RNA sequence: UGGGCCC
RNA sequence: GGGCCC
């Protein structure tokens, strides 16, 4: 977005310095070009003269303004996508009860009982369990008074900036390109879940290209469903964005919320309101308070769904700005936030679409390396979605999600102290698709020191997961 | 850390 | 309570 004001206040909000990610035995074997993100201004691995505070907010390069015609076109696209979306999901979008918003429903997982509470509770030393009863599904006086203000639409808040402690390519670690989490207040997440939680539940349940959303998917079983779909098409594109989250313009966000979350679609009048509070935001980072116009905070409830929805509308908007007669049947797409796979039988020109995404403030680039522009003919077996390739399983004849070995090495090279055994078992569930030999190699530095699931046990587990039939057919 | 999915 | 993706 656009940074409009940078206040210096006396109250300092501390951020998590020093990584909790420790090198594992595998790090010495694989030596990956990956490492924990820089968390301190004077980190020894940082490039000379690089101030960490400056790089964090370098993504904020302006809140791009749209003309009336682009806004009317956008409204049209948001309405058209909203039509398809609500046609599939239905219109049972009435507010969730407090109990349901805390504990979740079918499709929506419960709120995390002991994550960050946000502001101003962070300045009071309070955990989430001090404000909200997660077992009973009830809230205390503080949250209830805040819910009263949100009912009245008078609620004001700030976002707590957190440095994302994560494994990153050493280039971005050296560039100081640490990603940040905008931690929102716990009552905000609660109310957003009350306003749009049922909608979010229905989205997860109905994931697939029909609604253009992979939010709620299980790549183990759904790679078959998505894989067969996109292979059916002449052209497939792996479209990359740069700072997709931050570059959502206030025009696009506002219109999207107005078109998708209308009361005629079953929503409470405040669904549109609570989401609109995400457009213009105040962020607290240490000594500085930074006011931003545009972009989406990451700690928001439904941030992935909002991003997914926007992604769908962007692609429709771009094509309609360049071509005539472009409808929702003209192409097919799946997304998960910024991650996107597009396909069509029309030889569409995504290189020509670049400026049309720029009118929304988005920069599209080919994922297929730094190759000279978007090209045609590419299939689903060439693209990457959710850091996973689409690869045919020799034996079963099903698509499987395959991660790059360099990434799997990176993941296995670092762990939070004491979580290493548990990490190995979950990552095994990812590594199984790389094949028996590569599976053996990835866990080779761990043999004798930990329990490593056999290749056979996870392969038979995956076979049953993707389909109960072929597992029984093997008998 | 939010919206998943997995143990 | 972890891990992955986003
Ligand atoms: Mg939560
Ligand atoms: Mg991609």
Numbering used by the authors: 1 to 475
Quote the original article:
Here we describe a new mechanism by which foot-and-mouth disease virus (FMDV) can become resistant to ribavirin. Amino acid changes in the viral polymerase, selected by ribavirin, are able to modify the types of mutations produced in the presence of ribavirin. P44S but not P169S was detected in a 70% proportion in R-Ap35, as evidenced by analysis of both the consensus sequences and their corresponding mutant spectra. These results suggest that the three substitutions in 3D were selected sequentially during replication in the presence of increasing concentrations of R: first M296I, then P44S and finally P169S. To identify possible structural modifications of the viral polymerase associated with the important alterations of the mutational spectrum in progeny RNA, and to investigate how these modifications can affect RNA binding and polymerase activity, the different mutant 3Ds were incubated with the heteropolymeric sym/sub-U RNA of sequence 5′GCAUGGGCCC3′, crystallized, and analyzed by X-ray diffraction.
Since the biochemical results indicate that P44S plays a critical role in the misincorporation of RMP into RNA by 3D, and a 3D(P44S)-RNA complex was not obtained, we attempted the crystallization of the double mutant 3D(P44S, M296I) in complex with RNA. 3D(P44S, M296I) also crystallized in the space group P3221 space group, with the sym/sub-U RNA incorporated in the structure. The analysis of the electron density showed also the presence of the duplex portion of the template-primer RNA in the central channel of the polymerase of the trigonal 3D(P44S, M296I) and 3D(SSI) crystals. In addition, two of the four nucleotides of the 5′ overhang moiety (A3 and U4) were reasonably well defined, occupying the template channel, in both structures. The conformation and interactions of loop β9-α11 are identical in the 3D(P44S, M296I) and 3D(SSI) complexes, retaining the same structure that was previously observed in 3D (M296I) in complex with RNA. In 3D(P44S, M296I)-RNA and 3D(SSI)-RNA complexes the re-oriented residue R17 points to the polymerase interior, interacting with the side chain of residues N41 (which lies in the same loop of the substituted amino acid S44), and with Y285. Nucleotide A3 appears also reoriented, flipped-out towards a pocket formed by amino acids M16, P117, G118, Q160, F162, V181 and V183. These structural results indicate that the small movements in the loop, that contains the substituted residue S44, facilitate the large conformation changes of the 3D N-terminal residues M16-K18, and the reorientation of the template nucleotide A3. The conformational changes in the main and side chains of residues M16 and R17 allow the opening of a hydrophobic pocket formed by residues of motifs G and F and by M16 that facilitates the entrance of nucleotide A3. The polymerase with substitution M296I that acquired substitution P44S maintained the alteration of loop β9-α11 previously described for 3D (M296I).
